[PDB]
Amino acid sequence: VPRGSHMLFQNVSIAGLAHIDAPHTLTSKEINERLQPTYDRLGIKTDVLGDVAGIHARRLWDQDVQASDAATQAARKALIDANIGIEKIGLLINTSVSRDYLEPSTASIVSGNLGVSDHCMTFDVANACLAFINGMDIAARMLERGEIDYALVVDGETANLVYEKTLERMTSPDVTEEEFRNELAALTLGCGAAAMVMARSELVPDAPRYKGGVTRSATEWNKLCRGNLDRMVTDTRLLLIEGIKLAQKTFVAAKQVLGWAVEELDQFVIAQVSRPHTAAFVKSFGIDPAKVMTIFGEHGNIGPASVPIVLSKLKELGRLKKGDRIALLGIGSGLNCSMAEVVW
Amino acid sequence: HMLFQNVSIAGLAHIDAPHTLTSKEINERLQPTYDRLGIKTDVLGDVAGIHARRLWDQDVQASDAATQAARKALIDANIGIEKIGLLINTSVSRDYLEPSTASIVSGNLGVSDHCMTFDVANACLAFINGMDIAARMLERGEIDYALVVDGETANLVYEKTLERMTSPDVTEEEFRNELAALTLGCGAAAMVMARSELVPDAPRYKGGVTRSATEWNKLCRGNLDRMVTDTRLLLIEGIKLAQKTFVAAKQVLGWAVEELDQFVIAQVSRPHTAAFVKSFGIDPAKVMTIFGEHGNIGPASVPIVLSKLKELGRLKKGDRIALLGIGSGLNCSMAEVVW
Missing domain, CATH: 3.40.47.10 (Thiolase/Chalcone synthase)
Structure with a gap:
């Protein structure tokens, strides 16, 4: 019985992939030592990070690393994994929540750092934690149609600032229980980056x-x-x-x-x-x-x-x-x- | 090589923001500073050619402006929200880093559980990128109708940039590039795209x-x-x-x-x-x-x-x-x- 494709992508592949781990460990133990006075004032007796949320550590960058820098690092690693030069990339999409500026796109900055060709189309997509998938799908539509041969989808996340300012707010002698609860999940974020090279399947x-x-x-x-x-x-x-x-x-x-x-x-x-x-x-x-x-x-x-x-x-x-x-x-x-x- | 053959523009609308700020008014508030710094060209009006811009009411967010445009575009298309399978927000202005401004507009409009939403950013080209993105989905048959929305807010840019520039420490270099921000304006637009067989x-x-x-x-x-x-x-x-x-x-x-x-x-x-x-x-x-x-x-x-x-x-x-x-x-x- 001849069935249709259900609009799934055809002849789209993952040519390369890479990740970057951020270098500085911040443990929940150290966080809990900073929060302890507030925990005591709020009557909190369990380890809401390590035991309840299940987070023992996260990674942070230096304060001067921007989202574009982390994404670039991951992109250079994915290109090596795909064994291709930047000149072969026709589309570069940045998917991160973190962003250097409202304008220009973080994708343009990544692109400029890697030295993409003048045929390379670039832009950013934002959709919280699903955006990498969305970028994959946008690149896959182009690849399936044969408009490009290779696409980079890149994502660098910087949580340094949110950790710094949340830990300040959460250690105020006047922070309210409601405010503390509202911001707690910010202390479960981490830094890192990833990139993927996508391709027409005939090439790979x-x-x-x-x-x-x-x-x-x-x-x-x-x-x-x-x-x-x-x-x-x-x-x-x-x-x-x-x-x-x-x-x-x-x-x-x-x-x-x-x-x-x-x-x-x-x-x-x-x-x-x-x-x-x-x-x-x-x-x-x-x-x-x-x-x-x-x-x-x-x-x-x-x-x-x-x-x-x-x-x-x-x-x-x-x-x-x-x-x-x-x-x-x-x-x-x-x-x-x-x-x-x-x-x- | 093969262009889109079944992608159409079903409806389109725009919203003008309601408050006028003339460049003459800007120039009068800045005069003490223009003089104190020996400036005598009217950069806004004579060089840039911008004689006025519009501003929203206070507390209009990008999402609110986009929502207003989207509702008008749906009327121009004669379709209700339930037909929309994709909603892309393409504005520079954004309510937050997370969630997408698209999800907020979509929530305001009451899109269905089938509607895919996300934001595209690419400076002043993003609307065109959003239209292209949406075309590719339409052509493949993933959706029948798409909304591409864009609300821009510059109220804060003005409040801050003019406050900065008129403080007494402000140097001429700080002043100079803060002027480019005074060319921005508020407004919003939306477009309904559709498969051509439908329209x-x-x-x-x-x-x-x-x-x-x-x-x-x-x-x-x-x-x-x-x-x-x-x-x-x-x-x-x-x-x-x-x-x-x-x-x-x-x-x-x-x-x-x-x-x-x-x-x-x-x-x-x-x-x-x-x-x-x-x-x-x-x-x-x-x-x-x-x-x-x-x-x-x-x-x-x-x-x-x-x-x-x-x-x-x-x-x-x-x-x-x-x-x-x-x-x-x-x-x-x-x-x-x-x-």
């Missing part, structure tokens, strides 16, 4: 394939998590509850469009917000936890870079074999939920 | 081309509170890039200057526009301008000008319309609509 015939997938939304919840360059306020309770409801709806769509059944997928690459969000997601869907690599423990929540960083760490661990079906998924502020498939 | 008499979007000169990413650096630009150098290199883009547009779209009925250009200033027109040998009558009364509305300029052309009755069936701009980066994009 043994490379992994990207199929695309599905998106659903619940934009009546767009107030749940709000952030600027120095502050993020997050209703983590409704993020979890509404996020999982959204995900259940997007998984029904994934069964229809991608044919998914959880038990047939080999790895689930999840944008991870915290350990209880992750456990909840896995239990709700019956996912086998041995298929879910976590880096949140030691790196925290790297935003839209989380997914490609985890995919890059899987690659480097030798955990991915030819033919493995890899689910990329996440719930991002908005709310949005995206689920897509890579076949290694 | 067969509607204008068609063909696509276009882009070329870049990202060696100059330094030249125009814009935050919520400030805009620092190198205006002279931006202009020259901008034109060189445009000329290269036009060569590409000959090859992929068949462009010749004399065969285009309108040029809808991202609008920066009078010298910028006049240099563009002179370089290409374009008939100025084919180049509608709004900066004299609205200033630079960034990426919303392109759809606002197209919307004005439409509501003034200036566009006839079969007109070939060039949409184009030179954006910070530097980037240059040129695309075609056939009305």
Whole structure:
């Protein structure tokens, strides 16, 4: 029975991939020592970072590293992984939450640093922790159509400022319990970067394939998590509850469009917000936890870079074999939920 | 090589912001400082050519302005929100880093659980990028209708830039580049795009081309509170890039200057526009301008000008319309609509 493609991408591959770990460790122990007076004044007796959120450390850059610098570093590594020169790139998309300026795009700055050709189209996409996927899909539409041969999708995240200013606010003798709770999730963020080189499959015939997938939304919840360059306020309770409801709806769509059944997928690459969000997601869907690599423990929540960083760490661990079906998924502020498939 | 053949423009709208700030009024507030610094050219009015701009009410966010435009564009398209499968926000101004301004507009409008939303940023070219992005989804059959929205707010830029410039320590160099921020304006626009089989008499979007000169990413650096630009150098290199883009547009779209009925250009200033027109040998009558009364509305300029052309009755069936701009980066994009 002749079936249609379900609008999945055809002849689009992942030519290269890389991640950068930020160099400075900040432990939750050290954070907790700074917060201890406030914890005592608020009556907080559990370790809300290490024990409740499940974060033991995160990584930070130096204060002068901008999002563009981190993205560039990752892009140069991905080009080496793809064994291609910058001249072959026709499209460069920056997906980070962090951004050097309102104008010009962070993509232009990355592009200028790498020395892209004058044929290279560049722009930024922003969509909280799902944006890397969105950039992949935008590049995949161009590649599938044959307008370009190779595309870079890049993401550098800098959380230094938010940590500095949140820890100041959260150690004020007058911070309120409500304000403290509202800002706490900012101390689960981390720094890092990732980049991916995408290609027409005819150019890279043994490379992994990207199929695309599905998106659903619940934009009546767009107030749940709000952030600027120095502050993020997050209703983590409704993020979890509404996020999982959204995900259940997007998984029904994934069964229809991608044919998914959880038990047939080999790895689930999840944008991870915290350990209880992750456990909840896995239990709700019956996912086998041995298929879910976590880096949140030691790196925290790297935003839209989380997914490609985890995919890059899987690659480097030798955990991915030819033919493995890899689910990329996440719930991002908005709310949005995206689920897509890579076949290694 | 193969242009879009089933992507149409179903509806379009713009919103003018309601408060006027004239450049004469700006000049009077700055006079003590112009004198104290020995300035005697009226840079805004005589050199840039910006005689007024519009400002929102206080507390209008980018998302609010975009929402207002989107509602009008849906009426112009005669469709309700439930048909929209994609909503892209393309503005420079943004409410937050997270979530997308798109999600906030989408939430205000009540889009369905099928609607995909995200923001695109690319200085004054982003609307054109957003339209291209949306075209590619339409052509593949992912969606039937898309909204591309852009609300721009400059109230803060003015409050701060004028407060700074009139403090007594302000040097002439600080003063000088703070002037470029005083060319910005408020406004908003939106466009409904659609699969042509659904709207067969509607204008068609063909696509276009882009070329870049990202060696100059330094030249125009814009935050919520400030805009620092190198205006002279931006202009020259901008034109060189445009000329290269036009060569590409000959090859992929068949462009010749004399065969285009309108040029809808991202609008920066009078010298910028006049240099563009002179370089290409374009008939100025084919180049509608709004900066004299609205200033630079960034990426919303392109759809606002197209919307004005439409509501003034200036566009006839079969007109070939060039949409184009030179954006910070530097980037240059040129695309075609056939009305």
